[PDB]
């Protein structure tokens, strides 16, 4: 019944892994800083109307353990009634938090919800939380666990994506991320990180290499034994995996956080909030878990049928650039026009902070829909274990 | 909980001395070997009860044996009968066994194992429960946990204790995953044994001496295992340790890479029990190990491997196929005709046993190249420290290369290994038959040609026989003895005894075209080439062979066999039925072989076959293969490709068991496993029938059903024979 | 706010105790897989491709419980790879928040059939094993005056005036009702025994129960780090001394367990041939002293469903601490014959991430056994949170 609207969508800059500016910043501080920015934009916002804070986090241990969403509610002085819940659906945790916030508003049992994600990979590396699919030999031996890297190389092999093909996309991502920054596209959405004294720590995406060349990408070397033979035991018609993915055509390991304010139409009226976009539909699906990175394609199909739309009804497509082959396969499968796909760059140039990425690229499309005065955008991410989440937003 | 389970003669002798040291002497009066059977469990239960009751007058314990071996194996005759409904009994039995060893391990006083001989499986698990292990360095003594070779796991604490002693990785790779056997010197090198003695008479004295010093020097830690002290640190860390957790997810994938995806659950269960046990206390780890053991014993693969590698392999060594009522006959000089890869390996394994070998070829340069095969095998054996410089000289000195037929004087055992051709074999035998001893065995390493025909080229047909080896001879354990129509029983027993002398396993085959190994391996390769002609992807065919459990994929094996030889076998098979007025249905693989020969890709020897060979090294499949056979036009389920290769060999074994080519299922199972590489999890090409399991069910009826299903889809060659019906 | 969400199945494992527990050898992933196999056994023709998500609550998602335990369950059980799988943590009410999130996914129309529940093997992954952003940041921990749940419960008993014998009287009541519920067969069809890979029994009852508890035995127990008592009284400055009345005998037990709930739309139930057992009427979320969160969350869920206290037939509040339940009973005048009628966490245990789904399935069964209409389930939370849910028997 109730329609979920996006009122605010902000994010931190993405600090790089080695000698990154955000390494000295606890992941809790990254979220609190975004909360304070929302207050600056709406000083008379009745925070008592906020019923939940939903944060995606893939490695909820150490600095990110103990329900970091509740920690942000308490540390930022929000009312103790604002809840706080952490969730983990691997790469699409940030987008699942936004969709869960939207589905909470649609059910009529929640009126105004904050959602997003946070990941400080330089302080909490991925895999720090352990896991059963890797550290239980009985179930690991059965499900044939294979890292996302080999699965991405397997996709390039089957589809015929050469080393030059994936590197060509990686260059395109660098060029479009540079044009977006130099063009001021991110001026209002990227909230610079500062210390307790107000000193600047980071105000831009450190991982970007705007002077990338195809010759430089071709010099990079491609990314524990056994995983290569295990993948071919299932995909038995393939003789050899062509390893095309490097650090230059795969997503970057960065730190960052993102926040989205979602509420009903009546909630926006009571608080003087102008809606920016509307959540049209959300969907979840998946494909094989040995190759993975293939769940978003049927999730995109599922979210289109549910909203009664087709590819030609969508103005912008945003797929997380975990690996270049996954995006190129997604483009071939649905015949996505090149000028509609990741128009402001992606995680290859700017980084992939796991639990926050989904909310970041979601906020990116909200801004690009307004800047272009376009109508609809589709946001989707590939997921480990073979999952996929998709969302359609409509400009308001 | 008790030390007893739920009549049998006592196994353990009790002896307490004036110092208070109790000596438990294991001596099962119902056999020459101490076995972890129901008599032992009841005996150790009474002994352990007595140690607790008399704890106030006991200062140490020495576990010893009165046999030539310390303690070897368990009750296979009982384990092979355990049904899935018996999982509760099997669980309680191994829990009672480990409850006895845990009490002995935690008596508060030192326990020393005096290992006088072989301590294998349950025998080593008893010694591992002791705080100190002393081994006598005698000939034939071995130590290890070879439960995995029977499809089992060390369920008497072997997994839990070796992991506590060496860590997860070292225990799995070096002890548990493959059941490696160690000589007493190597056992101490890796920490499986603490010290050595020169003879068995020093053991119990040294055991009591160690107890006396341990009580005096280490009074607080006496009788306390390392994993029972505070501050125990598992070597290599626990799964929660950051260093081990970095590589731990790769352990199942590395295991799946080594096993090539073959369906053998025992290594998987050992790895799971090892890791899961390292996450909890010792007792809970021990109970987890019990559940994984009961999982394997009640399974079918363990029954297949217990049948093949215990019962069948024993019946063969006991002279099952050896003719009864024939005495021993010595061998003094062996004469090998031909210095190829086969003839050189035959000369090596014969001289390594201790026989004097005369290696004849047509030129001295060729015979010298044959001995170079032995010299290069001794060079690799010295560089890795597996032999001495003195034994290598005595080995090579027994190999006398030659090029003259006169050097075959005094030879009483001839083994011909020339090129596969009847006229060439008739020629080289007539030259030397009058120069060897009048009772000399005239053997032939032919693989397909009938023995009865080859025996006509000599006068002493009663001593002509087939002695079929497998390349490489130095590493292949089977010898296929083929009995011609004129071959006597004495010649059969003499070749039988020779096979054991060189350390190889024999099978006895009645004369026929292709014998048993060459004929059954023909159906396996033919099925793969048939699938290639049908349009199945070559990579899928190779995957099906590896995941079925074969040591080498079938297309790769076809190149090592040469398609030229493969075509000659089919032409001889057709001519062997056409010249009898019979009917011959060509295999679909014949058309594939002929087209590859037409293309000049006849195998690895030519330099090109189904694979590409650059500098004598295989380097990927031939790219033109997919366009030649329309690869991809047929995509059957992988299990169909696997079953087609397994069922073809199983059905051919049944035929040549009904035709009388084979005389026992033990020869069929061990022959298929050790001869041509039939997957060991099946238990052999004959055991595969009685142990098949699928969606239909398990047993001979399930095999017949699946075979009829394959026949309806892929051809009447999969129709089950009459002998398998009721 | 259109599609109605129904409960079709609600099962749980028995709860194994912390010290020398039967479930210590069982991985938490296997506790969930065992419940999934039970659902298959009860519906062998269920098209699992209709299941769109599996939502598991887990408070300590580290070690054996890390890496999205819900996705591990989907893959390990052989469920369709399109069934998703997500882990969430909202402290004690994670199991109920997973059920509520599953119900809200069905209401939005964007999901048809969802599995929901929780898992917590506390004997393997103890509470706090995941660390925490608050505990590892003294600057935040200093400003946000942090006091453990144990002291806040003692502070509630001090302010409300609950004596040591008052809280121990409730602990005796919980042990008695839990024993009566087990003897009467109330849990026969909802508690699924845990078995090993050979079918052998591991556990079939709540082994934390002490059905022979007496008033005298509870009085002999001693009350459960420095500073936290002074930090609490710095906020509640009008209180002089905190009366420590909570022991291990009147507080929730540390146990292992899991629970699964199948939630779907009316169309999904008809399509798969499933009988709806109850209907999700409403959910709500609101809340130094902690544990005072479920009182506004209950009023909010009653106000949201247009009901009052007199309309509810059964009240189920998690027995984290005896004083928390007694305050809840006093603040809303809950009749004693309606409050935790089958016992609670004091007797049977509190497996954190699974408790919310366990006590929900407890009320689905008791509503049908009594032929009653409505029930209310709520849990207190650390940090000051609270979740409540109203169900109606179908
Ligand atoms: O490795 S193969 O040569 O089998 C292959 C398979 C599929 C697509 N390209 C290549
Ligand atoms: O049953 S055991 O695995 O101990 C064993 C012992 C001796 C030879 N084969 C197997
Ligand atoms: O994983 S290992 O490389 O130790 C292994 C295990 C079983 C057979 N061969 C090798
Ligand atoms: O199944 S048979 O081996 O009889 C066969 C079938 C088709 C072509 N040649 C032979
Ligand atoms: O005496 S105290 O200040 O601890 C107290 C006692 C009862 C209720 N409120 C406060």
Q: What is the DSSP string of B181-240?
A: EE-HHHHHHTTS-SEEESSGGGHHHHHHHHHHHHHHH-SSSTT--GGGSTT---TT--TT
C-beta neighbour count of A215 within 10 angstroms: 8
DSSP reduced 3-state for B335 = strand
Which residue stretches of B354-421 are H helix? 364-383, 389-397
- Would you say C102 and C362 are in contact if contact means Cβ atoms under 8 Å apart? no
CA distance C163 to C157: 7
Q: Which two tokens stand for residue C323?
A: 């004083």
Q: How far apart are CA A347 and CA B128, in angstroms?
A: 54
- Please give the radius of gyration of chain A, using alpha carbons only, rounded to the nearest integer: 20
Q: Could you say which of A263, A279, A295 is where a domain stops?
A: A279
Q: What is the DSSP string of C229-264?
A: HHHHHHHSTT---------SSSB---EEEEEEEEEE
Number of domains in chain A: 2
What are the residues whose beta carbons fall under 8 Å from the beta carbon of C150, sequence distance 6 or more? Answer: C224, C246, C251, C321
3-state secondary structure of A60: coil
Q: Which of C25, C196, C198 sits opposite B284 (nearest CB)?
A: C25
Resolution of this structure in Å: 2.6
Q: Which residue has the tokens 């030659």?
A: B402
Helix (H, G, I), strand (E, B) or coil at C383: coil
Using a CB-CB cut-off of 8 Å, the residues of chain A touching B261 are 230, 233
Total structural domains within chain B: 3
DSSP string, A262-295: EE-HHHHHHTTPPP-EEEEEEEEEE--TTT-S-T
Same domain (yes/no): A106, A224: yes
Give C24's contacts in chain B (Cβ within 8 Å): 280, 284
Q: Nearest bound ligand to CA B314?
A: 2
By CB neighbour count within 10 A (0-12 exposed, 13-18 middle, 19+ buried), where does B231 fall?
exposed
- Whether omega for the bond prior to residue B444 falls within 30 degrees of 0, making it cis, is no
CB-based contact B568:B656 (threshold 8 Å): no
Do residues C107 and C14 share a domain?
A: yes
Q: Using an 8 Å CB-CB cutoff, list residues of chain C that contact chain B.
A: 24-25, 27, 63-64, 124, 196-200
Instruction: Identify whether residues C276 and C364 lie together within a single domain.
Output: no
Last residue of a domain, one of B286, B303, B330: B330
Of C100, C300, C97, C27, the residue nearest A67 (C-alpha):
C97
Pocket test of ligand 5: the residue of C229, C233, C235, C240 to mutate, having most ligand atoms within 8 Å of its CB, is C240
Nearest-atom index, ligand 3, CA of B267: 7
Looking at the fold, whether A173 and A284 belong to one and the same domain comes out as yes
A237 Cα: distance to centroid of ligand 1 (angstroms): 7
Domain C-terminal end among A251, A279, A307: A279
- 3-state SS class at C345: helix
Residues of C in contact with A142 (CB under 8 A): 76
Helix residue ranges, H only, chain C: 28-42, 69-76, 94-107, 138-143, 149-160, 164-183, 215-219, 228-235, 266-272, 294-304, 322-332, 345-348, 355-370
Tokens of B193: 């044994």
| Same-domain status, B559 and B505 | no
Residue C325 contacts by C-beta under 8 Å, 6 or more apart in sequence? C170, C317, C319, C339, C340, C344
The residues near A140 (Cβ < 8 Å, ≥ 6 apart) are A133, A134, B249, B252, B253
Quick check: A385 and C75 CB within 8 A? Answer: yes
Task: Verify whether residue A352 is a known catalytic residue.
Answer: yes
Q: Do C351 and C250 belong to one domain?
A: no
Please report, for residues A108, C213, C347, the alpha-carbon distance to residue C177 in angstroms, rounded to integers and kept in the order given.
37, 12, 9
A167 CB neighbour count, 10 Å cutoff: 24
Q: Examine the domain organization and report whether C141 and C236 are in the same domain.
A: no
Q: Whole domain around residue B358: which residue ranges?
A: 331-514
Which has the closest alpha carbon to B54: B15, B27, B10? B15
Look up the CATH number of the domain holding residue B96: 3.90.226.10
Q: In terms of domains, do C47 and C178 share one? A: no
Residues of chain B by 3-state class (helix, strand, coil), percent to 5:
50, 15, 35
How many angstroms does the Cα of residue C155 sit away from the middle of ligand 5? 9
Would you state the structure tokens that stand for residue C115, as one six-digit string?
């599995």
Tokens of C394: 């179908």
Closest CA to C346 of C176, C118, C159: C176
Name the minimum distance, in Å, from the CA of B299 to any CA of chain C: 10
Question: Which secondary-structure segment (H or E) carries A143?
Answer: helix A137-143
Judge if B371 and B505 occupy the same domain: yes
Contacts of C192 (CB under 8 A, 6+ apart): C11, C12, C13, C34, C35, C38
d(CA B292, CA B270): 8
**CA–CA separation, A146 and C115 (whole Å):** 26
Alpha carbons A97 and A119: distance in angstroms, whole number: 14
- Mark whether B281 and B187 lie in a shared domain: yes
Distinct helix (H) and strand (E) counts, chain B: 30, 20
Residue C383 to residue A86: CA distance in whole angstroms: 14
Instruction: Give the number of the ligand closest to the Cα of residue C236.
Output: 5
Phi, psi of C301 (to 5 degrees): -75, -30
Q: Which residues contact B450 (CB under 8 A, 6 or more apart)?
A: B484, B511, B512, B513
State which of B330, B357, B380 marks the end of a domain. B330
Residues comprising chain C, all counted: 394
Report the residue of C21, C25, C126 to disrupt the B interface, i.e. the one with the largest count of B CBs within 10 Å: C25
- Find, among C92, C68, C132, C90, the residue nearest to A27 by Cα: C132
- Residues B362, B302 share a domain: no
Q: Are residues B422 and B524 in the same domain?
A: no
| Minimal C-alpha gap between A369 and chain C (Å) | 24
Q: Are residues B259 and B306 in the same domain?
A: yes
* Domain termination site, one of C255, C280, C305: C280
Q: What are phi and psi of B204, to 5 degrees?
A: -60, -40
**Considering only CA atoms, which of A87, B336, B669 is closest in space to residue C101?**
A87
8-state DSSP, B435:
T
SS3 A19: coil
Give dist(CA B471, CA B481) in Å, integer: 16
Q: Which of A60, A115, A289 to substitute to test the interface with C, most C CBs within 10 Å?
A: A60
Interatomic CA distance for residues C218 and C211, integer angstroms? 12
Q: How many CB atoms lie within 10 A of CB B10?
A: 15
User: Does one domain contain both A158 and A69?
Assistant: no
Within this chain, do residues A266 and A287 fall inside the same structural domain, yes or no?
no
Surface-to-core class of residue B251, CB atoms within 10 Å of its CB (0-12 exposed, 13-18 middle, 19+ buried): buried
CATH of the domain at B522: 1.10.1040.50
Task: Verify that B348 and B478 share a domain, yes or no.
Answer: yes
Domain holding A380: CATH number?
3.40.47.10
**Other beta carbons less than 10 A from residue B589's beta carbon:** 22
B289-328 burial code (b ≥16 CB/10 A, e <16): bbbbbbbbbbbbbbbbbbbbbbebbebbeeebbbeeebee
Contact B563, B603 (CB under 8 A): yes
Same-domain pairing of A77 and A217:
yes
CA torsion, ordered C295, C301, C306, C311, to nearest 10 deg: -60
Confirm whether residue B361 is marked as ligand binding.
yes
The experimental technique used to determine this model is X-ray
Q: How far is CA C319 from CA C88, C157, C315, C327, C350, in A?
A: 22, 14, 12, 12, 8
- Measured in degrees and rounded to the nearest 5, phi and psi for residue A285 equal -155, -160
Answer whether A106's CB lies under 8 Å from A2's CB. Answer: yes
Tell me which residue has its CA closest to atom 4 in ligand 3.
B173
Are both B546 and B580 inside the same structural domain?
yes
b vs e for A276-305, b when ≥16 Cβ sit within 10 Å of the residue's Cβ? bbbbbbbbbbbbbbbbbbbbbbbbbbbbbe
A2 and A100 share a domain?
yes
Measure CB to CB from residue A67 to each of C29, C66, C91 and give the nearest one: C91
| Residue A194 near residue A336, CB atoms below 8 Å | no
**Neighboring chain B residues of C199 at a CB cutoff of 8 Å:** 84, 87
Domain boundary among B492, B514, B536: B514
Shortest-distance ligand to the CA of residue B171: 3
Other beta carbons less than 10 A from residue A335's beta carbon: 8
CA C51 to chain centre: 23
- Write out the residue range of the structural domain in which residue A251 sits: 1-124+185-279
- Closest by alpha carbon to B295, among B66, B526, B596, B79? B79
Kindly give, in sequence order, each residue whose CB lies less than 8 Å from that of residue B145, ignoring residues fewer than 6 positions away: B120, B121, B124, B125, B154, B158, B162, B175, B176, B179
Same domain, B297 and B426: no
Report how far residue A177's alpha carbon sits from residue A344's, in angstroms, rounded to the nearest whole number. 5
C200 in the same domain as C304: no
Q: Within this chain, do residues B452 and B489 fall inside the same structural domain, yes or no?
A: yes
As to burial, measured by CB atoms within 10 angstroms (0-12 exposed, 13-18 middle, 19+ buried), residue C89 is: buried
């Amino acid at each position: 019944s109730e329609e979920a609207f996006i009122y605010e969508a902000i994010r931190t800059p993405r600090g790089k892994q080695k000698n990154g500016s955000l390494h000295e910043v606890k992941p809790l501080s990254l979220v609190v800083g975004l909360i304070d920015e929302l207050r600056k934009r709406h000083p008379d916002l009745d925070e008592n109307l906020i019923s939940d804070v939903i944060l995606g986090c893939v490695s909820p241990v150490g600095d990110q353990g103990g329900d970091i969403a509740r920690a942000a509610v308490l540390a930022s002085g929000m009312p103790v009634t604002s809840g706080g819940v952490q969730l983990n659906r691997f790469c699409a945790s940030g987008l699942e938090a936004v969709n869960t916030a939207a589905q909470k508003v649609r059910s009529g049992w929640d009126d105004l919800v904050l959602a997003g994600g946070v990941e400080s990979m330089s302080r909490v590396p991925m895999g720090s939380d352990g896991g059963a699919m890797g550290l239980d030999p009985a179930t690991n031996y059965d499900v044939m666990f294979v890292p996302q890297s080999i699965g991405a190389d397997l996709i390039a092999t089957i589809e015929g994506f050469s080393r030059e093909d994936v590197d060509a996309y990686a260059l395109r991502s660098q060029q479009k991320a540079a044009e977006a920054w130099s063009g001021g596209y991110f001026a209002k959405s990227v909230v610079p990180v500062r210390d307790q004294n107000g000193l600047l720590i980071l105000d831009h995406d450190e991982h970007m290499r705007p002077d990338t060349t195809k010759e430089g990408l071709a010099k990079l070397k491609p990314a524990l034994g056994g995983f290569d033979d295990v993948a071919l035991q299932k995909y038995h018609w393939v003789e050899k995996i062509n390893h095309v993915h490097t650090g230059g055509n795969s997503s970057g390991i960065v730190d960052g956080a993102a926040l989205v304010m979602i509420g009903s139409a009546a909630a926006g009226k009571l608080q003087g909030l102008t809606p920016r976009a509307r959540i049209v539909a959300t969907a979840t699906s998946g494909a094989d878990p040995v190759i993975m990175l293939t769940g978003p394609t049927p999730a995109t199909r599922k979210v289109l049928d549910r909203a009664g739309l087709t590819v030609d009804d969508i103005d912008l497509f945003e797929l997380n650039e975990a690996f270049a082959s996954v995006v190129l396969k997604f483009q071939k499968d649905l015949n996505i026009p090149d000028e509609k796909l990741n128009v402001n760059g992606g995680a290859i140039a700017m980084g992939h902070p796991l639990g926050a990425t989904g909310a970041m690229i979601l906020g990116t499309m909200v801004d690009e829909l307004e800047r272009r005065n376009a109508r609809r955008a589709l946001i989707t991410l590939c997921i480990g274990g073979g999952m996929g989440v998709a969302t359609i937003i409509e400009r308001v | 909980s008790s030390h007893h389970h739920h009549m049998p003669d006592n196994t353990i002798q009790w002896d307490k001395d004036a110092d208070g040291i109790v000596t438990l002497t294991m001596d099962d009066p119902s056999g020459s070997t101490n076995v972890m059977n129901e008599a032992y469990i009841e005996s150790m239960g009474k002994a352990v009860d007595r140690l607790v009751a008399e704890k106030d007058s006991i200062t140490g314990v020495v576990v010893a044996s009165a046999k030539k071996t310390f303690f070897a194996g368990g009750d296979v005759k009982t384990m092979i009968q355990a049904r899935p409904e018996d999982a509760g009994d099997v669980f309680n039995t191994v829990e009672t066994i480990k409850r006895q060893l845990r009490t002995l391990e935690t008596l508060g006083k030192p326990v020393v194992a005096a290992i006088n001989g072989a301590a294998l499986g349950g025998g080593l698990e008893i010694a591992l429960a002791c705080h100190h292990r002393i081994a006598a360095d005698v000939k034939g003594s071995q130590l290890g946990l070879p439960e995995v070779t029977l499809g089992l796991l060390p369920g008497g604490g072997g997994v839990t204790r070796t992991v506590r002693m060496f860590g997860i990785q070292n225990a799995f790779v070096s002890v548990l995953a493959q059941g490696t056997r160690f000589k007493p010197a190597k056992a101490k090198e890796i920490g499986l044994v603490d010290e050595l003695v020169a003879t068995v008479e020093e053991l119990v004295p040294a055991a009591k001496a160690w107890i006396k010093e341990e009580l005096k020097a280490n009074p607080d830690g006496a009788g306390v295992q390392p994993w029972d002290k505070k501050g125990y640190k598992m070597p290599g860390g626990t799964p929660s340790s950051p260093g081990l957790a970095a590589i731990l997810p790769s352990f199942p994938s590395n295991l799946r890479k080594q096993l090539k995806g073959a369906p053998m659950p025992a290594p998987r269960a050992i790895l799971a029990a090892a890791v899961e046990g390292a996450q909890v206390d010792f007792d809970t780890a021990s109970r987890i190990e019990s559940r994984y053991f009961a999982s394997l014993v009640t399974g079918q693969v363990a029954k297949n491997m217990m049948q093949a590698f215990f019962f069948d392999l024993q019946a063969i060594n006991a002279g099952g196929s050896r003719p009864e009522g024939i005495g021993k006959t010595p061998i003094k000089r062996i004469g090998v005709l031909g210095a190829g890869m086969m003839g050189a390996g035959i000369a090596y394994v014969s001289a390594k046993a201790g026989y004097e070998v005369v290696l004849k070829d047509v030129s001295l340069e060729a015979a010298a190249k044959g001995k170079g095969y032995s010299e290069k095998l001794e060079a690799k054996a010295l560089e890795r420290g597996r032999t001495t410089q003195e034994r290598s000289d005595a080995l090579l000195a027994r190999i006398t290369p030659t090029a003259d037929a006169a050097d075959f004087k005094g030879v009483d055992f001839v083994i011909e290994a020339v090129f596969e051709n009847q006229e060439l074999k008739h020629k080289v035998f007539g030259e030397i038959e009058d120069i060897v001893e009048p009772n000399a065995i005239l053997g032939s390493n032919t693989s397909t040609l009938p023995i009865t025909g080859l025996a006509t080229g000599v006068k002493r047909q009663e001593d002509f026989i087939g002695i079929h080896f497998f390349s490489p001879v130095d590493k292949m354990p089977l010898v296929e003895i083929i009995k011609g129509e004129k071959t006597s029983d004495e010649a059969l027993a003499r070749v039988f005894d020779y096979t054991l002398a060189i350390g190889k396993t024999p099978i006895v085959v009645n004369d026929s075209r292709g014998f048993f190994t060459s004929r059954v391996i023909g159906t396996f390769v033919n099925e793969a080439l048939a699938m290639l002609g049908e349009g199945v992807e070559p990579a899928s065919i190779e995957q099906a062979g590896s995941q079925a459990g074969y040591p080498a994929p079938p297309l790769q094996l076809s190149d090592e066999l040469n398609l030229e030889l493969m075509h000659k076998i089919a032409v001889a098979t057709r001519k062997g039925v056409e010249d009898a007025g019979g009917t011959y249905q060509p295999h679909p693989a014949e058309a594939v072989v002929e087209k590859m020969i037409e293309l000049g890709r006849s195998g690895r020897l030519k330099g090109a076959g189904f694979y590409e060979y650059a500098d004598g090294k295989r380097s990927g499949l031939w790219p033109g293969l997919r366009e030649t056979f329309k690869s991809g036009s047929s995509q059957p389920p992988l299990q169909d490709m696997i079953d087609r290769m397994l069922f073809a060999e199983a059905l051919e074994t049944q035929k040549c068991l009904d035709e009388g080519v084979l005389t026992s299922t033990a020869d069929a199972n061990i022959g298929s496993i050790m001869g041509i590489g039939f997957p060991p999890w099946t238990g052999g090409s004959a055991q595969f029938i009685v142990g098949y399991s699928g969606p239909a069910g398990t047993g001979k009826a399930a095999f017949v059903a699946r075979a009829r299903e394959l026949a309806a889809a892929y051809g009447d060659r999969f129709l089950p024979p009459e002998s398998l019906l009721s």
